[PDB]
Amino acid sequence: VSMTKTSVDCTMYICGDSTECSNLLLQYGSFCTQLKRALTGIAVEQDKNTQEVFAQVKQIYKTPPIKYFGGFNFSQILPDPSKPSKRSPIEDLLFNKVTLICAQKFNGLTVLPPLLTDEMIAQYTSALLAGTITSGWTFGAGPALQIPFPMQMAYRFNGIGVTQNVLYENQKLIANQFNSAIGKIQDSLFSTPSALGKLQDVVNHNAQALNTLVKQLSSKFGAISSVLNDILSRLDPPEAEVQIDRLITGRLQSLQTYVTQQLIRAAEIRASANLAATKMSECVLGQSKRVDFCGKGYHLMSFPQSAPHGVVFLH
Amino acid sequence: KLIANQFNSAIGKIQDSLFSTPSALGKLQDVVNHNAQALNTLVKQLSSKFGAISSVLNDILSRLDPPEAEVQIDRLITGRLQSLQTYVTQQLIRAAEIRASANLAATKMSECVLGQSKRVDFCGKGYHLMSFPQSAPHGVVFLHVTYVPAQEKNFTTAPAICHDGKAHFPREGVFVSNGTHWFLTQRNFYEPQIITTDNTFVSGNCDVVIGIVNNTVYDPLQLELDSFKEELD
Amino acid sequence: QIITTDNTFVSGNCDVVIGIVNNTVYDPLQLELDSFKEELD
Amino acid sequence: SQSIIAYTMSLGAENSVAYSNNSIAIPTNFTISVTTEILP
Ligand SMILES: *[C@@H]1O[C@H](CO)[C@@H](O[C@@H]2O[C@H](CO)[C@@H](O[C@@H]3O[C@H](CO)[C@@H](O)[C@H](O)[C@@H]3O)[C@H](O)[C@H]2NC(C)=O)[C@H](O)[C@H]1NC(C)=O
Ligand SMILES: *[C@@H]1O[C@H](CO)[C@@H](O[C@@H]2O[C@H](CO)[C@@H](O[C@@H]3O[C@H](CO)[C@@H](O)[C@H](O)[C@@H]3O)[C@H](O)[C@H]2NC(C)=O)[C@H](O)[C@H]1NC(C)=O
Ligand SMILES: *[C@@H]1O[C@H](CO)[C@@H](O[C@@H]2O[C@H](CO)[C@@H](O[C@@H]3O[C@H](CO)[C@@H](O)[C@H](O)[C@@H]3O)[C@H](O)[C@H]2NC(C)=O)[C@H](O)[C@H]1NC(C)=O
Ligand SMILES: *[C@@H]1O[C@H](CO)[C@@H](O[C@@H]2O[C@H](CO)[C@@H](O)[C@H](O)[C@H]2NC(C)=O)[C@H](O)[C@H]1NC(C)=O
Ligand SMILES: *[C@@H]1O[C@H](CO)[C@@H](O[C@@H]2O[C@H](CO)[C@@H](O)[C@H](O)[C@H]2NC(C)=O)[C@H](O)[C@H]1NC(C)=O
Ligand SMILES: *[C@@H]1O[C@H](CO)[C@@H](O[C@@H]2O[C@H](CO)[C@@H](O)[C@H](O)[C@H]2NC(C)=O)[C@H](O)[C@H]1NC(C)=O
Ligand SMILES: *[C@@H]1O[C@H](CO)[C@@H](O)[C@H](O)[C@H]1NC(C)=O
Ligand SMILES: *[C@@H]1O[C@H](CO)[C@@H](O)[C@H](O)[C@H]1NC(C)=O
Ligand SMILES: *[C@@H]1O[C@H](CO)[C@@H](O)[C@H](O)[C@H]1NC(C)=O
């Protein structure tokens, strides 16, 4: 759903604490401004993506204190009030699997926090779960109208060409199969390290992009040295300007490459977030007839779960 | 009449909302502003020297002989070519974003305007009824007409009615009670009806469904029969 | 198809719907009843 | 008077739904709503 929000001090990356370099940098025009706007736009877009995927509910819905829904056990998807952060067992597992002093990459590169905290995302997920569980499909379309859960499921069965009496006669079987499947979801995610690979890949790509951008500072690009302090310490301005312009060219090209690839990744993340928001509206806030859109089989219902930089749907 | 009046009021509200809210069309103004920025930046970059003695080629050629001018010109060529490459790359990225938006707009035109969609929140908030396109500079504005439930009432329900050893289920609706009598209603609009053998279907006995309640299910044919030969002879 | 009580449903009286027209709606059960005891005795 | 304040943002109003084994809410009225979607 979202990407790490970065910010780059162009002058401090290219010309860190060097007035002579900064003055030479001024002769290239407004490149630092274009890069700054591009990264700001990406940073704003990531919060827009999170807001569009999770902030789809007008109100924060709560479940009853008596968590009995016809025999359907939702305790592994609903928030656990005992633990701090009020996340569900599955959400805690999802957050545990994916991994203010600027200790690393202190070369003008900073990371901005998201506008919504993990707790706020968990609160939106909890509201969505409470709405679907207690109000069915009416929650998404307007006011939340309470319906007994087994009758919500019977309606959802009618939605797939199965009569209501099939569910009522087999209600215990359906509840047991549901509870078993949820336990299987927890075992699958717990025991399979690769299950959340898409989100770890997003984290790894952002980590690579920043590690590469910082490592490029050590390159000489034809200069006598990669360190501006050594060039200014050793040479007079007229020779230093040549060595500095070689370093400026190399660092500016490195920043242009970084920003271009962040824009491409931002577009990919935006497309993913738009898909996630569409699925949230069509799978969680309703019942979908689109084949394989909301899981394998005939769709009955979906439940969102928060994950680092993303969303996990249980179909 | 109520539906027509609510529609007409909502349309007037659309005009007042767009007229009085300058930010309502921000997405299209943002596209215009981004293209204006990209071109203003591309032109402004021509004034940069990029290490040259001057940003103007006429002054370099007026002042220097070809062999020195070639060096100053190559500094300016490098700077201008990189500026053009940056502009074109960002236009390609913006073009991809606009293409995705246009594809979404075309999908919405086909599914919201040329039909009726069951995709939740695809064609506006509420249950979709219809949509109307409007042209806008560099874009499209869709007016989405939806049905929004209102004034819900709190009723007692049951999954089935037990009549004489048989479980009766709604064919198209939900069973409700006002506290004294059971009725069958449609789910999205309260309209109580008598529970009959035409409104419901029978499957199984009364000992299987959890939460089944006892109520009379009326059969028209039996009632007519019980009147038809009442005299007997 | 012939308009009957099986093809249609009834809700409200005739004074509410705008553009309602007058036509016979056929009920099979009444017709059979009107033939079933036609002799009477 | 007026000043700039900082606060933790609200996510929405709270709504405790009266869920029960045998309770259903059913609309007795409706609203026709017109909304606007703008796309480049
Ligand atoms: C809904 O399901 C949950 C579990 O799926 C029920 O709660 C309890 O869950 C734990 C595991 O989370 C079950 O195993 C226990 O694990 C602990 C681990 O330390 C162990 O010490 C215990 O001896 C036990 O093995 C536990 O059995 C389960 N509770 C019961 C009564 O089975 C929850 O009760 C379910 N809700 C409903 C309404 O049935
Ligand atoms: C439709 O399929 C379900 C399974 O998805 C059938 O229910 C399953 O029935 C078997 C017996 O044939 C159950 O196994 C038994 O479970 C008890 C548990 O105490 C155990 O003591 C027995 O030794 C045996 O293992 C199985 O648990 C049960 N599964 C569920 C989820 O209820 C169902 O009967 C099938 N219906 C038809 C009409 O074929
Ligand atoms: C369902 O809701 C609609 C509103 O969306 C109800 O219609 C509204 O009814 C009120 C009266 O209760 C009308 O207010 C009156 O309007 C006349 C106009 O001349 C005015 O003179 C009165 O003093 C009063 O203000 C309101 O205009 C009307 N709205 C519309 C759009 O017709 C409707 O009655 C509700 N139905 C049920 C069954 O609750
Ligand atoms: C539940 O609905 C029934 C049906 O309308 C109500 O009983 C009717 O009340 C009207 C009041 O004008 C009478 O004219 C009908 O003859 C009654 N019908 C029957 C079969 O009794 C009943 O009072 C309602 N109960 C509640 C609590 O609202
Ligand atoms: C619906 O009516 C049936 C009778 O037609 C009820 O069944 C009886 O319930 C009593 C409860 O004390 C038993 O003692 C009888 O033996 C039952 N008779 C039969 C034939 O089953 C049934 O309990 C009623 N259901 C409800 C919810 O009131
Ligand atoms: C449908 O038939 C009814 C009669 O069954 C018509 O109602 C009559 O209309 C005339 C019009 O001049 C009135 O004078 C009568 O008093 C009405 N009688 C009743 C009982 O309403 C009705 O107008 C017919 N509709 C159409 C469209 O022809
Ligand atoms: C600021 O420093 C103090 C100690 O000097 C520490 O207790 C506090 O947590 C720090 N705040 C942040 C945001 O790091
Ligand atoms: C619905 O009615 C029951 C009593 O039959 C009541 O306890 C419940 O609070 C009502 N629902 C609401 C939302 O007030
Ligand atoms: C629904 O029925 C179960 C039956 O065990 C009961 O425990 C639960 O409290 C009931 N729910 C409500 C809201 O009364």
UniProtKB/TrEMBL annotation, chain D:
It comes from the Viruses. This is Spike protein S2. It comes from Severe acute respiratory syndrome coronavirus 2 (2019-nCoV). The lineage of its organism: Viruses, Riboviria, Orthornavirae, Pisuviricota, Pisoniviricetes. The gene is S.
